[PDB]
Design a binder for this molecule. Structure first.
Ligand SMILES: *[C@@H]1O[C@H](CO)[C@@H](O)[C@H](O)[C@H]1NC(C)=O
Ligand SMILES: *[C@@H]1O[C@H](CO)[C@@H](O)[C@H](O)[C@H]1NC(C)=O
Lengths: 49, 349, 387
């Protein structure tokens, strides 16, 4: 977070943080659906929107 | 209820009347009365098909029609689907020519099918493949009418497991020299997806290449019903030939009868809008039977037809082929197990 | 000797020019064996004979092919359906005229089919070059959920993966639109300013009115609009800067009639083969046989040029693709629609008179907006991010 402040000042972007819904970094999983297009964790929300 | 049973082919002329009383005796459910009418179609000509069906649909006011056959003529299935669109009367087929796979379902139609989806049959193959432990294999498909490789991409989604599987894709074969391309084969386990009508020249091209003996096995799985070919052949049947096809007439009339029996007990009414072919020149009125078949239990088995309208868990059958041009069925298939017969110079122990 | 053809249309005046054309196109072939007859028939809107008249008269005449045209009746994928099943039942090739529907594009249901007019599905490529030639990026699309809708997307992404210029959002709505405002709310904060709408003509009226009080049809809003959603009630209540396509050969078939007769006349020259030339089955009374030389001459049908007629770019491709066609991009100015330019295999932008955009700005509104507000995710990891 101490790094994030330095970036925000240099470039003028504001922000609001919020932690991850479920505490997992992110991988690909599929048991009853398409093998790809299944990103959970941080890799999910960044891709979703 | 004025239920109708029809047949195509003069061979069913004698059994059309015989199955009449059998349907009444076999089907016995509370609150429902069965009134079958025996019919025989005059061949498979188009204009009689609409004339005979609609005139019976108008003169006799049939309430639901079930058709069955043993031929190899799937042409009339969409047409039967086509006329049923403007009447909202559900139609269910049993087996034979006009009962193969169909997709998609036409708008405003309830043409139920007693068939097996291509993906479901392919899934059964891999269960057989692991039992015999044939890890290295390649499938072969050709450019054939009414074919799409999209339904064959279920294999790419599968095969991700702790045992691992190998593939080489497939090589297309033109209808019209074929030995110059089919040589790109490495494993005896080969899966075929092509038209049955043009398969015979395809078999001849492969047979002259030495891919006929027990060293190289052949798979014949798909809408290629047959009940010069090599030895060691396997196919999927879904009890098409067995399971008393002379008795299924009582089975097919039963499931549709339960549809109105359940609808009446869920919504008491008599919505006979489709009493006449040309009662109203419009296609905006529907009696909404597509919302049914969520729970169909009979013969200690589930017959819940999906949106696609095929048996979700049918009694698929694996069959073999004796070298002496003899058809045979090996092993058996059930819900989720594969109880099968025969489970277990360069071949040394 | 004599070859019969199917010429079902919806106008008794059109069938007159067939007789003189066949009595003219015969001399083009040289009349080695050309004694062809028109043999036209008129269809009826009623649904009883549409399953009967298909083989009541046509197959009794020993026809080799049939021509079907869209009647001026306000219907789609309705009239060319009966011929699709009947012709395929006998494996008879069937070609459509002004058949502008996307469901006539799969060979599974219609084994044999053709058309000399491209359908609405293929105009998606024309959108790509326009946004490419205008240096547009970060685009979104609003599509209904139906047969066209699935066919709407699937063509679009294939042309974008080479450059990986993926659309920002592909949000879609149901065809049964009724007071949809939440969906349009989502496509507001994403900083696109460019939207591609490809719904039906009725659906445009709802969204146009729904977007009216949302004030999202002002400046900084470029819209890409297909042909079907310009006319009708879509003409009313539309934004000013609507850009919409067209097709010059559309709504007419007289030039198509000459091309249709000529191309099948060319088939006769390559009917002279040592292979069997067996005639199609005769009579609808009863048949269990099909005539197998159909696909034999099919491969040559798309291997033809047939210069002139319609702009002289007649090629054909699988399932009536109709590779070459002029579109003639047009535009809305105030209320009177105008023209900006034409198009072919590669776009042409003559800029006939001018171009306008919502708000009347005389400058291309660059569709983009820098997002000076963005979120950050984080996980609880002890030495780096406490909680
Ligand atoms: C960021 O914005 C402030 C005021 O809005 C401005 O003074 C500053 O120069 C901007 N940052 C840079 C790097 O110019
Ligand atoms: C129209 O066709 C020509 C000839 O192929 C080609 O240059 C382009 O597709 C179009 N013309 C222009 C100037 O873009």
């Amino acid at each position: 977070i101490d790094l994030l402040i330095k970036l925000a000042r240099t470039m003028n972007f504001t922000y609001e943080v919020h932690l991850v819904a479920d505490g997992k970094f992110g991988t690909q999983e599929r048991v009853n659906n398409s093998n790809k297009k299944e990103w959970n964790g941080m890799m999910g929300e960044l891709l979703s929107g | 209820l004025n239920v109708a049973l029809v047949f195509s082919g003069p061979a069913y002329a004698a059994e059309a009347a015989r199955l009449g009383p059998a349907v009444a005796a076999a089907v016995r459910s509370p609150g429902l009365d069965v009134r079958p009418v025996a019919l025989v179609l005059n061949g498979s000509d188009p204009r009689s098909l609409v004339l005979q069906l609609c005139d019976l649909l108008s003169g006799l006011r049939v309430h639901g029609v079930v058709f069955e056959d043993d031929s190899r003529a799937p042409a009339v299935a969409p047409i039967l689907d086509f006329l049923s669109a403007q009447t909202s009367l559900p139609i269910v087929a049993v087996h034979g020519g006009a009962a193969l796979v169909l997709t998609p379902k036409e708008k405003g139609s309830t043409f139920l099918q007693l068939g097996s989806s291509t993906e479901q049959q392919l899934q059964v193959i891999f269960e057989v493949l692991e039992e015999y432990d044939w890890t290295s294999f390649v499938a072969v498909t050709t450019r054939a009418p009414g074919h799409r490789a999209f339904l064959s991409y279920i294999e790419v989604l599968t095969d991700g497991s702790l045992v691992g599987w190998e593939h080489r894709g497939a090589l297309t074969l033109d209808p019209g020299v074929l030995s110059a391309q089919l040589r790109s084969v490495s494993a005896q386990i080969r899966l075929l997806f092509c038209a049955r009508e043009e398969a015979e020249p395809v078999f001849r091209a492969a047979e002259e290449a030495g891919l006929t003996g027990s060293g190289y096995v052949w798979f014949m799985v798909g809408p290629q019903l047959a009940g010069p070919l090599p030895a060691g052949l396997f196919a999927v049947r879904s009890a098409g030939w067995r399971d008393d096809l002379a008795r299924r007439v009582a089975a097919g009339v039963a499931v549709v009868a339960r549809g109105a029996q359940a609808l009446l007990r869920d919504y008491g009414f008599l919505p006979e809008l489709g009493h006449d072919c040309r009662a109203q020149n419009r296609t905006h009125r529907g009696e909404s039977l597509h919302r049914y078949f969520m729970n169909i239990t009979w013969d200690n088995r589930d017959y819940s037809f999906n949106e696609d309208g095929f048996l979700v868990n049918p009694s698929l059958v694996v069959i073999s082929l004796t070298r002496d041009r003899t058809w045979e069925v090996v092993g058996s298939w059930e819900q989720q197990t594969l109880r099968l017969k025969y489970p277990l110079t360069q071949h040394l122990t | 000797k004599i070859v019969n053809i199917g010429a079902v249309l919806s106008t008794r005046k059109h069938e007159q020019m067939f007789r003189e054309a066949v009595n003219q196109a015969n001399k083009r072939h040289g009349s080695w064996k050309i004694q062809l007859n028109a043999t036209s028939v008129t269809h009826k809107p009623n649904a009883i004979q549409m399953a009967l008249s298909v083989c009541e008269d046509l197959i009794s005449s020993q026809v080799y092919a049939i021509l079907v045209s869209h009647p001026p009746t306000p219907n789609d994928h309705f009239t060319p359906t009966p011929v699709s099943y009947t012709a395929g039942f006998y494996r008879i090739p069937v070609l459509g005229l002004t058949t502008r529907m996307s469901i006539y594009s799969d060979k599974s249901i219609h084994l044999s089919f053709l058309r000399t007019v491209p359908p609405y599905s293929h105009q998606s490529s024309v959108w790509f070059e326009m946004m490419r030639v205008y240096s547009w990026n970060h685009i979104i699309l609003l599509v209904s959920d139906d047969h066209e809708g699935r066919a709407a997307q699937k063509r679009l992404e294939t042309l974008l993966e080479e450059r990986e210029s993926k659309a920002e959002k592909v949000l879609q709505f149901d065809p049964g639109t009724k007071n949809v405002t939440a969906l349009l709310m989502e496509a507001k904060e994403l900083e696109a300013r460019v939207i591609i709408l490809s719904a039906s003509e009725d659906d445009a009226a709802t969204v146009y009115r729904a977007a009216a009080m949302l004030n999202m049809t002002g400046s900084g809003y470029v819209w890409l609009v297909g042909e079907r959603e310009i006319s009708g009630n879509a003409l009313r209540y539309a934004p000013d800067g609507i850009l919409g396509l067209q097709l010059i050969n559309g709504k007419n078939e007289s030039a198509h009639i000459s091309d249709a007769v000529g191309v099948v006349a060319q088939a006769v020259h390559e009917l002279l083969e040592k292979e069997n030339i067996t005639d199609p089955p005769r009579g609808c009374v009863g048949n269990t046989n099909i005539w197998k030389t159909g696909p034999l001459f099919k491969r040559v049908l798309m291997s033809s040029k047939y210069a002139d007629g319609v702009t002289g770019r007649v090629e054909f491709n699988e399932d009536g693709d109709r590779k070459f066609a002029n579109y003639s991009i047009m535009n809305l100015q105030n209320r009177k629609l105008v023209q900006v330019g034409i198009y072919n295999g590669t776009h042409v932008i003559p800029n006939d008179r001018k171009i306008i955009w919502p708000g009347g700005e005389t400058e291309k509104p660059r569709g983009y907006q820098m997002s000076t507000r963005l979120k950050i995710v984080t996980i609880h990891q002890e030495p780096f991010v406490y909680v």
